[PDB]
Design a protein around this ligand. Structure first.
Ligand SMILES: Nc1ncnc2c1ncn2[C@@H]1O[C@H](COP(=O)(O)OP(=O)(O)NP(=O)(O)O)[C@@H](O)[C@H]1O
Ligand SMILES: Nc1ncnc2c1ncn2[C@@H]1O[C@H](COP(=O)(O)OP(=O)(O)NP(=O)(O)O)[C@@H](O)[C@H]1O
Ligand SMILES: [Mg+2]
Ligand SMILES: [Mg+2]
Lengths: 15, 466, 487, 466, 128, 128
């Protein structure tokens, strides 16, 4: 949510 | 032709021509300025007036100011002499090493290799990197999404690749910094230098550096990637090598696109991006391929917005990627380097129909084991490592050996790792893992495999380890 | 001469505003000084808004624009087969000019109510899952839908390739000329695409329109209409064509780009109000003509790319509301190793049953039924202890049947081959067997009956049904083969 | 009068007049064309120019081209000679059976029946459909609407209803195909022929067909509804006997309006729809109604974009119905057909003083249990049933049995259900539902209730399940 | 008329949702730039102006009154919505009906929590 | 002035959010084209050109420096909104503050997990 972008590239192995 | 400035609104200059009107994309030169001001042509407003986007600050411009049609798009010094140099968006030197003296100049805006120039086949491009080559093989003229950032060996890996391309393919590399942080650029510069890839003394530099700093206006950060592209194209279309293109970061490209778009007053599309999002991207991506003459391979640094894989920016981008290289902080924490994630990193060419049944099987082998071990991981810690079967205990052992065998010493990091680098060959790579899977080295101990090259070293290390 | 000519007033954002051209008709092709092409979109009181079919860098204020007196059209005819053309019909295989006799508007209205007839002829894919569970009829519109990389195009291909089995045939009524339209893709992909087609000796019967990632939005937008017109030639002459729109997703974005630049009100997802129509008009053109109109047909397999399996989005819903069924491929399935990753439940074929072969009816009929009873008990839950013999048994076919539906690429099967293998599973000849053996059984049991029994196959295939003898013969055939099967 | 084409943009043709300006809504005929091209006047732009909407493709038109004032609005053949025929927006035959030879013609644009003209009789219309009859019963001379996202069951439902109602009507029927599939028109036509509703031999057909499908230009799609509409009006007022009116899909008319709206030069409203959305729907819907003169039982299909029921189109539609059948993708996905949402479908007739209290009580009974089950769902979702109360578990069982008992095989959908269609009589429905509620079947398994007619069959199915 | 003449009137505006749409239409067609959610920047005012008219006059003015019961249609039970809040912020309270409540057997489907009366007991008999 | 003359200077921008707004106001009034959140197409540039001016010089230049602490005010923790996105993307790291934390007793409310320093230990003393 709101600040998730500060994790990051988290679901990357899905792309 | 000599035009006048009819209007200045932020980064968008309007220029009127009395006699001949410059076609779209041409590069105009603003007359009478301390420094070079290039205006790229963007539209024909009718009435002998063009609408252009400034490649630098329009501060001080005056209605009536003189503009000289360079009668072409932005052209830049291309060739070997570029290697080891840092260059602007309009092919200027920004390293203070004097003029970039080349024979040829190459306009940045270029169409892509016609269908008849296309290669008809998929070939893996070997880097000598165990994980990469084994589980997520790069592809000639393909696009790789490089995930992960700091702490994790991003620069070091970028530097080894460069090296390994020069070594195993005699191919050079380009580095395009789209929206680079001035601080970080200079830091990249000296880092390459200390590692050799750049050589200020001789002519052994294996990389050319293109920079589009974050302070630059949208148009500049918009083009820099192309500029870098032009450069790489040369080592392919003129010398038929296998170039490497690094775009850092692919996101800032797209973003730069939207800014220019907005400035041009066009209505934004979904999520505010440019209506031309897909085209903007494709007219660029498509130039990156294997033609009959050679091939350009691009390593693109991706930044996913809001961690949303379906965001238009990222989504669009995936349409062009042939493989991902996921750098992982966790892996790094195991001391494992390169810190590439063997389970998250993927490749389109990982098809037996492409890498061959052998290669394909090994890969699929390494991965499953890696997967299985992952399962047990939870059990081990809680219920203790012992209900483990003669079978469950081997999957682990092997896996653990595997995880290590997947790590490796880079020549780039010799300067102060006090350890010799290793450029393992694809053949050696398949063999190595093949055997571990096989059970040939079950007797060998874990640490034997940590930070080595070819399996042979795993064996010798065991010796020295009693 | 401002009657048949015009001078450009302004070029920008792919819309050239030409002065003059007093005689152009709406939608007529026009030519630019630079040999560039365009469409007369807006006929305004003092200018003509033209849609440039290429890079507008080439056009400048003042350029000459000449009519052609022709409403946008394209080369049409059998001489396209084996050719790789652009959205305008121009060859791009560098194989010499297309010797086309006929031409055809890209924007013709589809055939009405009267001239059509219910699809009744099978349009074999060669893919078990599809041909058994989601039968396509000739003149049907069946949508291929899924996320990126789920094996969408792959279905189109095996289908194209499977056609050779008839095209090399005697009967013209059993043939199918394919047309593969590429939109927004990578050339490197199209190039490899034909290479694969060529090596399969399928290009001989295929036309390829390409408007790729680098082509002007208007070309991408156009491409499907052109490919459609070419397919129309076959439909109109008692012949039978297959057109693949890969993807409609990218075309839609191309059109949207155009729309926004023209400044048309962006709606849901920023898409223009008419994007549905963009698709309906196109897809209406696929059709099954009756005998009094040539009995010919056009079959469309349009591709749509969903984001995160969201099958409710604006574009996907639009397309679903046009075609006559869909084949959704699942990301889950694909990774779990089930390929084609076809979602048996979700997918549909509104009109294809009638086009379905009896033989398949015979075996495939009790397949979804069985799979129906398997769909349930097959939970997400990986570790579940079960009871009840029946439900147990149900769960047992399910895994076998599922193994029968997996298929590799480039190896489209003959309908009779499909019924054969399906027969083995649906009849129980694989119950006593281990799910990991299924694949292996198939190849081995298939080569076996192909080698030894071309006799029974031909019957099945010829009769088109499974006669008492044929079935009797088949039963023993599985029986003995089994008995000899090495674990 | 003879105007001249001044401008052309899609379906919007502007025509200038010199002597007589045609009033708004008038149909003009474009001169110099292979086939008829009617233009409907939309507005007076001033300057003796009129903005119009074409009724067919505009390709080929040329500025300056001659246009003729027909002197009236689009008129079409009305009378019994339309029965068994297929006709255009503009009233021309499209069945290849020659001209429709009628005594009278009627214009598509008419005013809605006045207030004093309204009717208030409310009679239930039994359909044989379990969910419909029990929870949101239709009504003679009433307005019915079938909401549905793509491929949910709108059409099937319309067919089943034509089957279960139209077939044994005794009065006339009008089917209006608006913006849907041509193949469907063809499917119906031939079927209609087969069942004898359409007779190409005698004058005994009971259905008139009007079509303006998915292949027509916006203007056509924006008027066919009106066309079909008019046909029905005639039988209602001009002859006194009860009509049946089926439209598939009325959403298409609204969509069509949005297609031309920008062209008309209007500031778009929310979601990019035309600012006149509601009025447009209103002056049209208001003609589809029963009156003191005649009765019109209308069933309209209403496509819901992106499955969004809050979309301005469907949203604004609710207000015009007497009964609403909302179809659900979620339900459909569960395999329940028809995929009617029992808590979202409504009917003005659901009143004890109209359906009786037995009917009124079961209905509310079923809804309350389904609502209750709905609230428990969140929990059931993470933790399943285990942690549920013995009492709660009983609602869940019953609900899941009622849920299933609501489904039913349609003749029209036999090819898919694999079962023989069923038509349950109202008392049968009230009953079977009572018992379920009353715990008279807590012993039978859910499955027994799925896909069946009367409760009796659900008992048997139970035996067969053993 | 009643209000100003010492009489008592009750007015139901069923519903103000459709009126706003009408307003939005009329407004856009006049070319007045569309505001939030496409409505004219003054939708609030459109309703305030109207509902302020409902009132209780003093004995000096006849002691008459005007009571208003305006209807607003939410979507997805969302009362926080812009129009719904616009109107909630004018009136002397609200009666919020939920479909959940309704189906559940709670009819009227009044949601006690979310409903209010800014008049309080002053509008009730002592008995009540 | 400090940076350039062998001296060291610290600068706090409080906030860059308000400044963005100021700029937006001007842009829109001048009628330039509006983008997401109504921000001009050169709002990113506005900050990048600002934040880059901070830097560590070389002895050849005086060794003087200019460190920057720019402040950004998020909304409901939406770090991904427009302006926060730019600035995050421009700077060498972030110190993320949370209300939950704050009220929970953690003061300063630094969310340690989500905060960063690209520069890292290269700026920490050996002691630390
Ligand atoms: N039947 C199959 N069996 C095994 N592998 C398959 C099969 N079909 C496809 N593949 C693999 O799956 C990959 C993706 O299939 P593809 O048809 O290219 O998917 P897609 O949905 O078109 N994706 P994209 O077009 O890239 O967005 C192919 O490149 C093959 O490697
Ligand atoms: N009552 C039903 N019983 C069984 N299957 C059904 C039923 N209704 C619909 N289906 C299935 O769903 C498909 C679509 O039905 P259909 O009535 O055409 O949906 P629709 O809402 O008319 N679709 P669209 O007009 O494309 O949005 C049918 O072809 C069946 O496969
Ligand atoms: Mg594809
Ligand atoms: Mg339908």
């Amino acid at each position: 949510x709101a600040x998730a972008a500060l994790x990051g590239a988290a679901x990357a192995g899905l792309a | 032709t000599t035009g006048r400035i009819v209007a200045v609104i932020g980064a968008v200059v309007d220029v009127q021509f009395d006699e001949g009107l410059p076609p779209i994309l041409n590069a105009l030169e603003v007359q009478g300025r301390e420094t070079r001001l290039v205006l790229e042509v963007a539209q024909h407003l009718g009435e002998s007036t063009v609408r252009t986007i400034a490649m630098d600050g329009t501060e001080g411009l005056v209605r009536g100011q003189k503009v000289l049609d360079s009668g072409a798009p932005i052209r830049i010094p291309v060739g070997p002499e570029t290697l080891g140099r840092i260059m602007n968006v309009i092919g200027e030197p920004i390293d203070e090493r004097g003029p970039i003296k080349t024979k040829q100049f190459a306009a940045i805006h270029a169409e892509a290799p016609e269908f008849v120039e296309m290669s008809v086949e998929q070939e893996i491009l070997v880097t000598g990197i165990k994980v990469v080559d084994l589980l997520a093989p790069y592809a000639k003229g393909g696009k790789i999404g490089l995930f992960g950032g700091a702490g994790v060996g991003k620069t070091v890996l970028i530097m080894e690749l460069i090296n390994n391309v020069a070594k195993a393919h005699g191919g050079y590399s380009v580095f395009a910094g789209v929206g680079e942080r001035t601080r970080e650029g200079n830091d990249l510069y000296h880092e390459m230098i200390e590692s050799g890839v750049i050589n200020l003394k001789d002519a052994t530099s294996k990389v050319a550096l293109v920079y589009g700093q974050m302070n630059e206006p949208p148009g500049a950060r918009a083009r820099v990637a192309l500029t870098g592209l032009t450069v790489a194209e040369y080592f392919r279309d003129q010398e038929g090598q296998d170039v490497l293109l690094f775009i850092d970061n692919i996101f800032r490209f797209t973003q730069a696109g939207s800014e220019v778009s907005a400035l041009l007053g066009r209505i934004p599309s979904a999520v505010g991006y440019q209506p031309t999002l897909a085209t903007d991207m494709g007219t660029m991506q498509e130039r990156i391929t294997t033609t009959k003459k050679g091939s350009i391979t691009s390593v693109q640094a991706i930044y996913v917005p809001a961690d949303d894989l379906t965001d238009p920016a990222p989504a669009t981008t995936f349409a062009h990627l042939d493989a991902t290289t996921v750098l992982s902080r966790a892996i790094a924490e195991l001391g494992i380097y390169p810190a590439v994630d063997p389970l998250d990193s993927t490749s389109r060419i990982m098809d037996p129909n492409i890498v061959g049944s052998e290669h394909y099987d090994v890969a699929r082998g390494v991965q499953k084991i890696l997967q299985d071990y992952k399962s047990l991981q939870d059990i081990i810690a809680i219920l203790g490592m012992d209900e483990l079967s003669e079978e469950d205990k081997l999957t682990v052992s092997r896996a653990r050996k595997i995880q290590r065998f997947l790590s490796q010493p880079f020549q780039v990091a010799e300067v102060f790792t006090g350890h010799l680098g290793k450029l393992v060959p694809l053949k050696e790579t398949i063999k190595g893992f093949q055997q571990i899977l096989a059970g040939e080295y079950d007797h060998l101990p874990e640490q034997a495999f940590y930070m080595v090259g070819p399996i042979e070293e795993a064996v010798a290390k065991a010796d020295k380890l009693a | 001469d401002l009657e048949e000519t015009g001078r450009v007033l302004s070029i920008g954002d792919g819309i050239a505003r030409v002065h003059g051209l007093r005689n152009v008709q709406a939608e007529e092709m026009v030519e630019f000084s630079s040999g560039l092409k365009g469409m007369s979109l807006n006929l305004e009181p003092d200018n003509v808004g033209v849609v440039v079919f290429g890079n507008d860098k080439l056009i400048k204020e003042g350029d000459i624009v000449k009519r052609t007196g022709a409403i946008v059209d394209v080369p049409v005819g059998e001489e396209l087969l084996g050719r790789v053309v652009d959205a305008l019909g121009n060859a791009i295989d560098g194989k010499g000019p297309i010797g086309s006799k006929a031409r055809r508007r890209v924007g013709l209205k589809a055939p009405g109510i009267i001239p059509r007839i219910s699809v009744r002829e099978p349009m074999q894919t060669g893919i078990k899952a599809v041909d058994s569970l989601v039968p396509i009829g000739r003149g049907q519109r069946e949508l291929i839908i899924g996320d990126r990389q789920t094996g969408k195009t792959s279905i189109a291909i095996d289908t194209i390739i499977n056609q050779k089995r008839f095209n090399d045939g005697t009967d013209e009524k059993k043939k199918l000329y394919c047309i593969y339209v590429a939109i927004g893709q990578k050339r490197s992909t199209v190039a490899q695409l034909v290479k694969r087609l060529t090596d399969a000796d399928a290009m001989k019967y295929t036309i390829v329109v390409s408007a790729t990632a680098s082509d002007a939005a208007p070309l991408q937008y156009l491409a499907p209409y052109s490919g459609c017109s070419m397919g129309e030639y076959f439909r109109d002459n008692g012949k039978h064509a297959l057109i693949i729109y890969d993807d409609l997703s990218k075309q839609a974005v191309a059109y949207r780009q155009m729309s926004l630049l023209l400044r048309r009100p962006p709606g849901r997802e920023a898409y223009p109000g008419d994007v549905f129509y963009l698709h309906s008009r196109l897809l209406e053109r696929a059709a099954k003509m009756n005998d009094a109109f040539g009995g010919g047909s056009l079959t469309a397999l349009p591709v749509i790319e969903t984001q995160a399996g969201d099958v409710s989005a604006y574009i996907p819903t639009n397309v679903i509301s046009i075609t006559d069924g869909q084949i959704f491929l699942e990301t889950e399935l694909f990774y779990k190793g089930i390929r084609p990753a076809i979602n048996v439940g979700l997918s549909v074929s509104r009109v294809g049953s009638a086009a379905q072969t009896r033989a398949m009816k015979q075996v495939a009929g009790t397949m979804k039924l069985e799979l129906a009873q398997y769909r349930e008990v097959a939970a997400f839950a990986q570790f579940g202890s079960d009871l009840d013999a029946a439900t147990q048994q149900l769960l047992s076919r399910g895994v076998r049947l599922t193994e029968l539906l997996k298929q590799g690429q480039y190896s489209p099967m003959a309908i009779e081959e499909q019924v054969a293998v399906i027969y083995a599973g649906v009849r129980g000849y694989l119950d006593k067997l281990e799910p990991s053996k299924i694949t292996k059984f198939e190849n081995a049991f298939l080569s076996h009956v192909i080698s030894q029994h071309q006799a029974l196959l031909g019957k099945i295939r010829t009769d088109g049904k499974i006669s008492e003898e044929s079935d009797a013969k088949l039963k023993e055939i599985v029986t003995n083969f089994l008995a000899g099967f090495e674990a």
